[PDB]
Amino acid sequence: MAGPCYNPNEHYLPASFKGVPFDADSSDSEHGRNGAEAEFVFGERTGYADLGIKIRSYSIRARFQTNDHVALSNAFIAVLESTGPGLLVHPTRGPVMAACRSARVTDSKVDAAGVTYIDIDFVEANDTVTGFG
Amino acid sequence: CNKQNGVKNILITFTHCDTGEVIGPISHEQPDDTLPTYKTCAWTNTALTNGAVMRSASNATMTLPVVRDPRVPLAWYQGCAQIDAQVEKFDGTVMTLTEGAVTEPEESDGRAVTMTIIAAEIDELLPPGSLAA
Amino acid sequence: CNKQNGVKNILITFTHCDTGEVIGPISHEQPDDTLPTYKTCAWTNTALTNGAVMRSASNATMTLPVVRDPRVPLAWYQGCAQIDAQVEKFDGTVMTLTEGAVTEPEESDGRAVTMTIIAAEIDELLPPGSLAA
Amino acid sequence: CNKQNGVKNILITFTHCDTGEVIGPISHEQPDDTLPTYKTCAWTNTALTNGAVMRSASNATMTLPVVRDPRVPLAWYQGCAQIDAQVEKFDGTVMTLTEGAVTEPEESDGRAVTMTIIAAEIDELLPPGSLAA
Amino acid sequence: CNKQNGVKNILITFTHCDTGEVIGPISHEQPDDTLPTYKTCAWTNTALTNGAVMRSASNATMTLPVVRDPRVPLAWYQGCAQIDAQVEKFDGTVMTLTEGAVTEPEESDGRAVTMTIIAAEIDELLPPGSLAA
Amino acid sequence: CNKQNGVKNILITFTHCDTGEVIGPISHEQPDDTLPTYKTCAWTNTALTNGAVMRSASNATMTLPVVRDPRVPLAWYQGCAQIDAQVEKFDGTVMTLTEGAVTEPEESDGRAVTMTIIAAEIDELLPPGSLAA
């Protein structure tokens, strides 16, 4: 950001998942579009064909510093493992629906005692009817 | 006398972490001619291209060189106890700190101890007649 | 007396980011015998082989060591406020900076502050009789 | 004389690690005007963001410059033997260490040796009238 | 006097890169007791094993500390302009440089500037009686 | 005189590797006021957490600054010959080294040479009345 009048608390939304607040530390995303590039034989021309949108994906990193971090961290994992997708408040992409796909919890007792990091890997999940069309 | 630059009072309160003992504010005296230093703005700017910047968390820190009190164990002055400090300069300024922690302590000969303290925020009391609110 | 290398007037105008307050162009005095240093070309050349060069974005930088005003909080002088500075040398040169920001503040004892500022461009007013337009 | 900062007695008791012989507590003297240095807090803090910290194991160390006794091989003062040291300052403080080990020795000319010692715990004896238990 | 190590004349001819205006050859003076330095061999050697060497491109450089002319903007003395310099030593040697470029400028207080210049080739004029062609 | 810290005799015995020549134990003199430094403990310690230590191989080192003898080629004093040295201090300590090798020689003007030697072990002869066996 330009100028010294920026205020990060005013531009980044507070993260959350299924209604439980948590402290976010990073925010990424992935978008795209599925193509059908094709190159003929002995030819000097190529082609293309747009064939749908690509499924998004979000990754976040969380940090727990407060006193007695294990209880909060160990209690938040019980939410990521709950069945079904739920609302996710991405810090920059706004509220979206996603389902957790993996999570690695990092910790130590001598190298770094008193802070727990946990990486996450979300995937967009839109509800669909059950009668296949 | 207001133009004199120096330190007038130094009060420190110790709170042992393994026993909960509290020792009332004890006056202290500095070991040499150096003065304490301060950093109150808890946000750091990094230089981007074309006059823009970037904000990062950082902390508020204080460097407090004081003479060890011969009635308090040397361990307390290092990272084995909480610290609450107050420093009053000749002009009238007062800088208070609470719930501070000592970081990366270095060896001391037994009399002169230099403490690096970090806290969430440091409150400043300017002399009468300030401008900012 | 036009051959004297020195600073004559220093004017600063703070602008608190979190409250929109503005403080008039207060005057300041310098703490020691050092002088401010300037860089007004916003492009950097790197040395290639055989006399070539490479251009990089870079910024316009300033270095302003000034005595703190006892009526302004120390935080403002660090990266918690916008700055608008002007320095007038004895010979006549006047150099103005607007919308600057402080970067990587260091600890200060309460009187001496050495601000590092960056802005899009710096305007120089040469004495009468310049050659370049 | 209680305000004099200095060392009164230095006692060392070697224990050869390849023969098991023990040499009684011998007295030593200083090589120069420097003094020993101490660090008694086992755990070490580091600075996280927003006032938090991280704790790591670390150890309790010692720095003991002493003149080599002319009746003990120079190897013993290096990492080729165990050490048990005691230092009594003029004010009355006593610092005891047992089962210490020498780390990363450096070359010595045969008279002055600067030993670095690490131990699980260092016990301190304050003068009469201490406050903390 | 033919054994006095010093500089007699310094001539510079700027060429603004954004407007094409050219300022005739102006004379300059030194800021202090230092002298310029030169390197005229384009290729650079490195040490292989057993007396061999590797040859690399490199360039021909120059270091010219000179006092800023009060009738020229400070920007021109940095990456924001071209330079054509000539230095005449007391003994008679003349070093000429054309189409030079300034690299990695550093902040200057407004009087003393230490320009670093690189060019494809620097031509040297030895006093009468030279041996080499 | 037994409390004087100094060197009395230095004897060296070269052995040209390329031709098997042997030169008797010539005496030498030192170039300046510095003294040799020694390290006679083969194994080296490292600091683990909570008072433990790691033990590594290392070697036994020597440092012998001596004036070059004008009847011996300068190459021999560098890493082109074996060395067998003995140093006798004033007090009486005698330290011997055999089958040493020079490592990483540096350039010498022709008179002062500072050899760095390494050997399997160094034998020390303490004055009469030692304690350890």
Ordered DSSP codes for A95-122: EEEEEEEEEEEE--SSSSBS-EEEEEEE
Q: Tell me, what amino acid is at D57?
A: A
Q: Which residue, among D54, C99, C75, has the nearest Cα to B43 in the 3D structure? A: C75
Closest Cα to residue E100, out of E83, E86, E77? E83
Phi and psi for A57 in degrees, rounded to 5? -170, 135
- Rounded CA-CA distance F127/D68 in Å is 13
Q: For residues F61 and C67, give the distance between their C-alpha atoms in angstroms, rounded to a whole number.
A: 55
Q: Is residue D75 within 8 Å of D105, Cβ to Cβ?
A: no
Residue C90 is given by DSSP the state S
Question: What are the angstrom distances between the C-alpha of E60 and each of B83, E105, E123?
Answer: 59, 18, 10
**F30 is written with which tokens?**
């030192």
Name residue E100's amino acid.
G
- The sign of the CA dihedral E41, E43, E47, E52 is negative
Element (H, E) at D76: helix D74-77
Across the interface, which of B47, B51, B91 has its CB nearest the CB of C70?
Answer: B91
Q: Which residues of F69-102 are buried (b: 16+ CB within 10 A; e: fewer)?
A: beeeeeebbbeebbbbbbbbbebebebbbeebeb
d(CA C115, CA C100): 11
Q: What is the Cα–Cα distance from C79 to C111, expressed in whole angstroms?
A: 17
The resolution in angstroms reads 3.4
Of D45, D63, D89, the CB nearest to B107: D63
What single-letter amino acid sits at F117? I
The C-alpha atoms of residue D57 and residue F58 are separated, in whole angstroms, by 27
Question: Measured at the alpha carbon of residue B65, what is the angle toward residues B60 and B71, in degrees to the nearest 5?
Answer: 115
Report the residue count for chain A: 133
Q: Which of F2, F4, F8, F38 would best serve as a mutation to test chain D binding (most D beta carbons within 10 A)? A: F38
Contact partners, residue F112, CB within 8 Å, separation at least 6: F31, F32, F65, F67, F68
Method by which this entry was solved: cryo-EM
Residue partners of F65: CB distance under 8 A and separation at least 6: F30, F31, F32, F34, F36, F112, F113, F114, F115
D91/B107 touch (CB, cutoff 8 Å), yes or no: no
Work out the number of other CB atoms within 10 angstroms of the CB of residue E105.
Answer: 22
* Yes or no, beta carbons of A2 and B45 under 8 Å apart: no
E49 three-state secondary structure:
coil
Which chain B residues are closer than 8 Å to A65 by Cβ? none
Suggest the residue from D8, D38, D95 to mutate for an interface test with chain B (most B CBs closer than 10 A): D38
Q: A126 in contact with C at a CB cutoff of 8 Å? A: no
**Cα–Cα distance for residue pair C132/E24, rounded to 1 Å:** 12
What the block records as the tokens of A67 is: 């006193």
**Cβ–Cβ below 8 Å for D48 and A65:** yes
* Alpha carbon distance D83, D86 (integer Å): 10
Q: Nearest CB to A114: which of D49, D50, D53?
A: D53
Task: Identify the CA nearest to B32 among candidates B116, B115, B117, B113.
Answer: B113
Pick among E104, E106, E114 to test the C interface (most C CBs inside 10 A): E104
Residue whose structure tokens are 């009847």 = F71
Closest Cα of chain A to B44: distance in Å? Answer: 10
A2 touches chain B (CB under 8 A): yes
User: For residues C40 and C121, what is the distance between their CA atoms, to the nearest angstrom?
Assistant: 7
**CA A7, CA B48: separation in Å to the nearest integer?**
17
Distant-in-sequence, close-in-space partners of A79: CB < 8 Å, separation ≥ 6:
A17, A18, A20
Q: Rounded distance, CA A62 to CA A69, Å?
A: 12
- Is residue A61 within 8 A of residue A119, CB to CB? The reply is yes
Backbone angles phi, psi at D86, to 5 degrees: -145, 135
Q: What residue type is A25 in one-letter code? A: D
User: Among E96, E77, E94, E74, which Cα is nearest to E85's?
Assistant: E96
**For chain C, the helix, strand and coil percentages under 3-state DSSP, each to the nearest 5:** 5, 45, 50
Contact status, residue C122 vs residue C59, Cβ threshold 8 Å: no
Residue pair A76/A24 in contact by the 8 Å Cβ criterion: no
Handedness of CA A71, A74, A76, A79 (dihedral sign): negative
Give me the residue label for tokens 């800023």. E68
- State both tokens at B131: 């401008």
What are the DSSP E strand ranges found in A1-133?
Answer: 16-17, 20-21, 24-30, 38-39, 46-47, 57-64, 86-90, 94-106, 116-124
